[PDB]
């Protein structure tokens, strides 16, 4: 459905909390490897309020945020 | 026809509030560059291909119109995600 | 309960005090290493005002801070 | 005549469209090794309005460009 | 008694000058290297004004301060 | 006379022109290395108008500019 | 006496030669002083380009002013630098 890209996450809105729907690939580091992002699909996670991006599809809208603005995982 | 240079891509884009435009934007990915290069000389390979349709940030990358047809091009890092 | 992400930790507030309840993995050199956090659950550590989140849950309060917002611990 | 110093070019302006005329020897990775530019001279490159240093060489316009201001090339 | 975290010290105070009383682990390098704090406990230092974070505990004032805060140490 | 420091060099003034006089050691790189400057004594280069450092110095005025601010060599 | 830190050097500064055009109409100073140098991801230790005595001259308002002894000093960073006069 939606492909995050790189160092990214789609979530669903519920400091904000919001449901991960779908993961990047990571960040690449400067030697090549490409670090996996720390949260699966699933998870809950809490982010900064006013942070990432609002992206509306069918109706429905998700926010698709940087590992980096990812605090923490409740759960 | 239009080669994308770097870590770059080139995509064709695709009552009520007037501000509700101020969203996201979709393209196609009609041509994509050789990527970025690491400080260890290493080349990272676009992670977009021909044909995928990416979302970008609203107002981000270059507009240029050419033949009377209207291109944007985008920097690797502007691309939020693909929708498949 | 609340997993902090990366190189962050969370803490119970008591400059602030606050004691370390959870630590995250830290933070990702490039060369692919991970640095461990330098404080360890039951730390009281030093941070600046106005630092940090703050989250509440179940009427509980906590902050979530970066190692880079931890100034010291009290020991 | 003009040599463009590291990663740079001058092009004969025609977003902006101009040619390149000349390429200079490309950027300096920390780990010396020098990354050589992407365009050949002939080439149509498109790059950022108000972007570069414009010189004008018997009466002549050209533009020195350096290779993160060269968007595209057009063939 | 103030233990100070990665590349900071607690200093005494007496531009400003202070004395070095305890000094942290020192910044850590992309390479994972380890770089030490270059003054050591006793030394004089002068410290940036309104450099650093105050801190009292029972009735005695002391300042944490990072490595870069340190302008030079007076011998 | 006035050696330039680092990734720096000399100019005698004439987009700006000038002669370089004098050149500096180089940038270092993270790895250890020292890139020598791409200009030599001699060379014609040209510069950002209002770029570099002007120095006057019994009388002569020159310009302090750092190998970033020179765009190319006019031969 | 005063020892910069790390990648700085501590320099007393010069005061220009007054102009005239009848009546009287970029800083120059003098190392007293000079840290260790930059550190590099590598570990090593960079040295500092100048020395004590060197003349420097180096961006006007850049650095740390600094009193000590009714005597003024400024703490600068070598890449503040532009060049030594000799």
């Not at 492909?3 to 729907?21: A, E, S, T, W, Y």
């Not at 400067?30 to 991006?53: C, W």
């Amino acid at each position: 459905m939606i492909k995050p890209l790189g160092d990214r996450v789609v979530v669903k809105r519920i400091p904000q909390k919001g449901k991960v729907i779908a993961v990047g690939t990571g960040r690449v580091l400067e030697n090549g490897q490409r670090v996996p992002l720390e949260v699966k699909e699933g998870d809950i996670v809490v982010f900064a309020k006013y942070g990432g991006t609002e992206i509306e599809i069918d109706g429905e809208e998700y926010v698709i945020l940087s590992e980096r603005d990812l605090l923490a995982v409740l759960q």
